[PDB]
């Protein structure tokens, strides 16, 4: 009695054929960076502190593959600096001459092409986790405003 | 001085005459499933792990009705299997011979007709929450690709 | 002062005498299919992935009728295959030996005659929504080009 | 080499001398009304729900004029009811004893004479938009069939 | 080799000459209201709970202007109640004798004329955000059905 | 009993013979730019912040082709500046001496001819995504008004 309709529910997923699958808690997330002062970013080559995140992998069989690495794809700020993201801004006066890198666990930047791969990682029989860091990078004088970036990634076995 | 026009803002809502109303945070949402390997879906009757969601109800008076149940409506993959969604794909080569079910809290699939109702649930004077789960189901051999589903629902008092 | 004429505005609507009326957002719409490769459509009986749409009904009284179904009317590609649309092309070299079906929620094709009706659907006191799917179908070898189809429909109480 | 003629292309436009000009996307458009049941239109004074549209104005200087209003011109169904359109039908048995009004943002009908003007509207330096609504109106008992209306308009500064 | 055409991409934007510009994430959005029971809207003067939204402003210089306020423009349900939206319905039997207001941060309704402005707001050198609320309002007895509204806005410096 | 006709439904799609097909969610879309102040666009060579979009590809086989790139086709504002769109305006006083570019992931403008191609991109076995950015560009002094652009594209394997 007194039946009423509801709303709508969507679904998102994938079916892949590889060694180890990507956890559902890491297909889309949001890492914060907080704020950073212009006095810490004065000249070219300036660098702030870094925060970290991770990529979780589940149902990981060692008998079909041994190691794993990743690769990233974004948008360079300049053809001279081929390792810094551009700014996925809101087209309403964001910051100028800034950018964010991606640091490997070995401690180096990555080439944003989708072909440069990172170092290897030995796996287990189950849950595996690979950490990464990110930090701001400047190519000169900094300006106040806003800053947002966005990128995708890709793994290899 | 210097007045400038803005943009446009829309509104969506309903007015219903029933016992307990649907929360605004659950008329439209998006639950992720992540990924799943083809090796876990080999033969007919294959089953992966399940994630969960919930439906929130507010302003719920016990004096006009006691219990509540739901029902779902989608699209079957086959007339033999009357409890599995089809794939609301992008018509660009998604996965084949897969599908997603809906598991009740009593632990059974539901008939996608909009007439089969679930078990009852005792209510409170205020916020009430009913949980559900979903998981992948196969009817044979699996293929790589993509997978998206979509369905609506309907309650009863 | 300084009065200037404007343009012209048209109106389209209907007045029907039935149980439940058709929403204004679904008397005329356009569903996309994107693209599809010829390698996925090789032999007779080939099938691609499917996208979905819906028909919305409003002001729906249960006291005058209980269930509802639909029927479609188009143009067959052949008298042997009485369930596939032809191609409402632009007469400038579109694709050959392709076509689009309509899948019911029970998971079957429909006979394009305007007399074959689909399965029933229980109604509410208000907004009701009935989903459907569509996908490409081939009767042999496929050719590149373009593809457009068009059809009408009809309901029953 | 191998030159072939094409087709024909037309042009439509105006040159006016006033404060603010009419956008090209609103000299001719088509607003739908969907359907409406005869049970909602039973006696004289019956009223259905309303949909809305808008008129867009561009290059609007405030220094030459301040406010603006509109006026409409159509065909009355009766000399007693001087605010309801007639039915621009197809002379093949459309609906009887129906009609459509035009509601101002202040919430009143308009006199279809081309001399009754609406309320004022303060302007900006650029894009301005004035909304309006329309709904069905009856003067007695309704009949099934079809319904189409058409009208023009005129502004004032 | 094997070059294939793509689709079509559009663009929307504005160029304004003022103090502080409107963020791209708020020129067009959609706020939900969920559902509301008829028992909470019984007599004239009835009121339900409220949800909130905000308007984001970027690249905001304090040296050219100090404060800011907004104004709204819609369609009144009645000339007696000059602060309640009408219902931008689908002309297929939506709800009757309902409506939605707009509450300022000072806690008052707004006059839907496009000339009544709200209270001031002190600005920063960059991102600024102004919140607002909305809730259902009734002028008598409520009916079941649907409810949709739509309005535009306009700022001042 | 009491059968009533419905409306009309259209279909749009393509059949192509290439390596990787275009997703249905990206044959036609609309990216917003919001607003931008005239003070940020003062002289020739002025530049605002950028927003981003992407092109999704599905059912992508690596065994028939390896890399992919795109090309664009629009309308230049001048024969001296062969990389800036014109303004697909409404012929009612839009902005003057503005325009929008397209930035590659390598960080350069593109020649609007339909023959200049972008950089390569390594592919996967399935879903692939290629990002791009867009921003306003000026060739002198800016004017207030409106701004809309439109372009098509084309891929290569």
Residue numbers in the entry:
A (entry chain F), B (entry chain E), C (entry chain B), D (entry chain A), E (entry chain D), F (entry chain C): 2 to 158
Quote the study's own text.
Adhesive chaperone-usher pili are long, supramolecular protein fibers displayed on the surface of many bacterial pathogens. FimA (type 1 pilus) and PapA (P pilus) assemble into a ∼1,000-subunit long helically coiled quaternary structure of ∼3–4 subunits per turn known as the rod (Habenstein et al., 2015, Hospenthal et al., 2017, Hospenthal et al., 2016). The biomechanical properties of the helical pilus rods allow them to reversibly uncoil in response to flow-induced forces, allowing UPEC to retain a foothold in the unique and hostile environment of the urinary tract.
Here we present the 4.2-Å resolution cryoelectron microscopy (cryo-EM) structure of the related type 1 pilus rod. Type 1 pili were expressed and assembled on the Escherichia coli cell surface, from which they were sheared and purified by density gradient centrifugation as described in STAR Methods. The resulting electron density map was resolved to an overall resolution of 4.2 Å, which is consistent with the map showing clearly separated strands and visible density for bulky side chains. By far the largest contribution to the subunit-subunit interaction network is made by the main stacking interface between every n and n+3 subunit pair. By contrast, the N-terminal portion of the FimA Nte lies flat against the remainder of the FimA pilin fold. In turn, this implies that the stacking interface is stronger in type 1 pili (Andersson et al., 2008, Andersson et al., 2007). These findings are indeed supported by our cryo-EM structure of the type 1 pilus rod, which has a larger buried surface area (1,616.2 Å2) in the n and n+3 (stacking) interface than the P pilus (1,453.0 Å2) (Hospenthal et al., 2016).
